[PDB]
Amino acid sequence: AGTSICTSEEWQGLMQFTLPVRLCKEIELFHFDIGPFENMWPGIFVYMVHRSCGTSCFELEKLCRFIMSVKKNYRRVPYHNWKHAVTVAHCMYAILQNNHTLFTDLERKGLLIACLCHDLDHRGFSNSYLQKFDHPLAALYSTSTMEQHHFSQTVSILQLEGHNIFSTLSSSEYEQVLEIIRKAIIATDLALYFGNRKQLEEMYQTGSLNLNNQSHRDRVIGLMMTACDLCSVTKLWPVTKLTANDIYAEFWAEGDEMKKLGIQPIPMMDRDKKDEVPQGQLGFYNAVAIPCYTTLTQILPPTEPLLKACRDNLSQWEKVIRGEETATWISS
């Protein structure tokens, strides 16, 4: 209720943070897992912004206040949380570094920010749930319900005193960047991914894809956002498997609320149907993740390691289905 604001101690701490030298090299790689470095996550974001956009892209104070306030407006939910925000932002960084000059300075700063912000104030409930039970948000936002709220939260944080990192842009560039962020955030609505990917595959296979065409650029950026949102499936298996535990914790919690409202949940959301999880993963990788990274690699060749990793993880789920799993550790 209201927008939360970081403490002076919080942003000043981030300002003096220094990244360990050994991680510099690691942060460049797609498969990098932020997991073991929690105290460093905000500093990792500063580092990526500085490397991609320059140490003078944003005023350091406004940037540190922005980052720490963004953190404070992620809720303590199992998956759609601050950890996921930084993971998605790190994926975008790796994509941008590998494709740097395809994107404008305005796009890079807008996308890194869009990724950090893209699940702001997530409550651990899906668009399906909010619309089924007519939460106030579904009244306000008829489609892409959570995504429109995440954008609105982004704008609220920028509006906090001393938090507007984009103020020094020309009025034209300011409006362009807010549009980059809005489109990028909305694009993380998976309902829109299916159409976008089919369109892109079509433009690619016929050779009409043209990055000089703004509607094409917007669509390629949308698929980048999907790729980054889903990137837990491109990590090393143990990391992917552990993250799946977190995702399913939210799903099962939503399913439990549905049962209280007299409605049996979809199996994916049913904690009494865990046997169906490996097949559900197969379905998800075949329907969403594999096609995503497949098309993204056609359009941006350097992103090929995301697709190779996603394929390796599909193989691991297939192993699970056939009863070939080995010992597994969980944090419960």
Residues annotated catalytic, as ranges: 80
End-to-end alpha carbon distance in the chain: 30
- Least Å distance, CB 270 to ligand 7ZE, is 13
Q: Which of residues 102-121 bind Ni ion (CB under 5 A)?
A: 119
Q: Which of residues 89-108 bind ligand 7ZE (CB under 6 A)?
A: none
Annotated ligand binding at 281? The verdict is yes
Report the residue from 82, 284, 293, 317 that binds ligand 7ZE according to the rule CB under 6 A.
284
Candidate ranges 20-28, 70-78, 258-266, 277-285; the one touching ligand 7ZE (CB under 6 A): 277-285
Q: Tokens 């590998």 belong to which residue?
A: 98
Q: Which of residues 226-285 bind Ni ion (CB under 5 A)?
A: 229
Annotated ligand binding at 229? The verdict is yes
Closer residue to ligand 7ZE in complex, CB, 164/281: 281
DSSP string, 272-326: T-GGGHHHHHHHHIIIIIHHHHHHHHHHSGGGHHHHHHHHHHHHHHHHHHTT---
Decide which of ligand 7ZE, Ni ion, none touches 290; Cβ closer than 5 to 8 Å per partner kind: none
Strand ranges (DSSP E) for the chain? none
Locate 120 and state its tokens: 């702001």
- Assess 230 for contact with ligand 7ZE (CB under 6 A): yes
Long-range contacts, 292-296 (Cβ 8 Å, 24+): 292/193, 292/197, 292/223, 292/226, 292/227, 292/230, 293/227, 293/234, 295/197, 295/200, 295/201, 295/204, 295/223, 296/223, 296/224, 296/227
Chain-centroid distance, C-alpha 221 = 13
x-marked contacts with ligand 7ZE along 237-276 as a string, rule CB under 6 A: -------x--x--------------------x--------
Measured between alpha carbons, how far is 111 from 91 in angstroms, rounded to an integer? 11
User: By CB neighbour count within 10 A (0-12 exposed, 13-18 middle, 19+ buried), where does 101 fall?
Assistant: exposed
Decide if 264 contacts 258 (C-beta within 8 A): yes
Annotated ligand binding at 80? The verdict is yes
Closer residue to ligand 7ZE in complex, CB, 128/176: 128
**Which residue is nearest to ligand 7ZE, using beta carbons?**
284
- Least Å distance, CB 123 to Ni ion, is 11
Measured between alpha carbons, how far is 84 from 87 in angstroms, rounded to an integer? 5
Q: Which of residues 171-200 bind ligand 7ZE (CB under 6 A)?
A: none
Closer residue to ligand 7ZE in complex, CB, 68/231: 231
Decide which of ligand 7ZE, Ni ion, none touches 265; Cβ closer than 5 to 8 Å per partner kind: none
DSSP string, 46-88: HHHHHHHH-TTSS-HHHHHHHHHHHHHTS---SSSSHHHHHHH
Q: Which residues of 106-139 are buried (b: 16+ CB within 10 A; e: fewer)?
A: bbbbbbbbbbbbbbbbbbbbbbebbbeeebebbe
Decide which of ligand 7ZE, Ni ion, none touches 253; Cβ closer than 5 to 8 Å per partner kind: none
Closer residue to ligand 7ZE in complex, CB, 281/303: 281
Size of site (CB under 6 A) for ligand 7ZE:
8
Measured between alpha carbons, how far is 209 from 48 in angstroms, rounded to an integer? 29
Decide which of ligand 7ZE, Ni ion, none touches 10; Cβ closer than 5 to 8 Å per partner kind: none
x-marked contacts with Ni ion along 65-104 as a string, rule CB under 5 A: ----------------------------------------
Binding residues for ligand 7ZE (CB under 6 A): 230, 233, 244, 247, 268, 280-281, 284
Binding site residue list for 3',5'-cyclic GMP: 80, 281
> Which residues line the annotated binding site for a divalent metal cation?
84, 118-119, 229
Q: Which residues bind Ni ion (CB under 5 A)?
A: 119, 188, 229
